[PDB]
Amino acid sequence: VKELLEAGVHFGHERKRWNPKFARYIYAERNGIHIIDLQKTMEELERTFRFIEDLAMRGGTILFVGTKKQAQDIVRMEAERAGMPYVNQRWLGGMLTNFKTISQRVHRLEELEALFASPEIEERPKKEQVRLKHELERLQKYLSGFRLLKRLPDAIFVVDPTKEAIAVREARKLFIPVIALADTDSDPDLVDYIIPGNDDAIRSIQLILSRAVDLIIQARGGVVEPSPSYA
């Protein structure tokens, strides 16, 4: 499922803005840029993909977490492929530790999923009506993938654990496996199942994400091949 010629997308970056705790996954500092060693990645993917495949094999649920620009749309696709919950735009504080309370915003969502599912009564003030069509969109803008998350997840798969320290901190507090792909600017000790590598190259973000999702399909029966590897 893995590769060895994945070294043709990323092998690391981020020039001397590093976290010293990451040095045990760094091979050399060449063009001003810290270069990640992938023999450290290959062993680690063996751990992570051992965890991911074994997790879906028993009915798990991985909350995929991506927020930044270079990983915005790709995390939407890959989580929808495996039918997995994603958080796309903003990570709402408490989403995990205050789950039974933010989930109270998807019930309001399903409400406007029924209301604007013709008709209940649309014959109630259009102002009072189009008031809601904006509240509808907003809920979809932030709860589009979290809605399928009906219960506190079994693990989370984040794109950037520094950029997403809030989500990590909550999951760590709930004894939730924190699995993540991370480059030279993050804390290995905070990640339960690590994937050392670039998290800014879309050419690399999609790679370790798209063919990680592929592994999730084969663990819940049957395979599919093509996912969006847009150029």
Partner: protein, 137 residues
């Protein structure tokens, strides 16, 4: 430097709090006889006599507990506490009858005796007292 022994107890203390794999100690015979105790008792994986920038040192190989769950995954320490007792400013000598038990036996006490460097349990076995070098648990 004024107390080579307290320096080594402290080099290790500082090394275990940042979870270093190893830490070098300036080499001496009395320090071997103390690291001899620490390894056999499980507190360290052991040591080897090495050479740093031409000078004899002692690479001490440390040890830690399992990775823990929750916030702060950092593992519990195997050496929780390693404390100088007898100091150049105040020597501490106990006869055999007043050798302390460290943490109700779940810890050790290293002493220097005319029969060599022993643990507290080793001292009463040989029936001798000595100079309380340190307590460890």
């Amino acid at each position: 430097l004024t107390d080579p022994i307290a320096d080594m107890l402290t080099r290790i203390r500082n090394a275990t709090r940042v979870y270093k794999e190893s830490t070098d100690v300036p080499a001496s015979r009395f320090k071997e006889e103390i690291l001899r105790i620490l390894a056999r008792e499980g507190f360290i994986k052991g040591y080897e006599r090495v050479d740093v920038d031409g000078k004899p040192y002692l690479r001490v190989y440390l040890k830690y507990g399992p990775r823990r769950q929750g916030p702060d995954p950092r593992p519990e320490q195997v050496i929780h506490h390693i404390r100088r007792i007898s100091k150049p400013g105040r020597r501490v000598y106990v006869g055999v009858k007043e050798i302390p038990r460290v943490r109700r036996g779940l810890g050790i006490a290293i002493l220097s005796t005319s029969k060599g460097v022993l643990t507290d349990r080793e001292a009463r076995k040989l029936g001798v007292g000595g100079e309380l070098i340190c307590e460890v648990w």
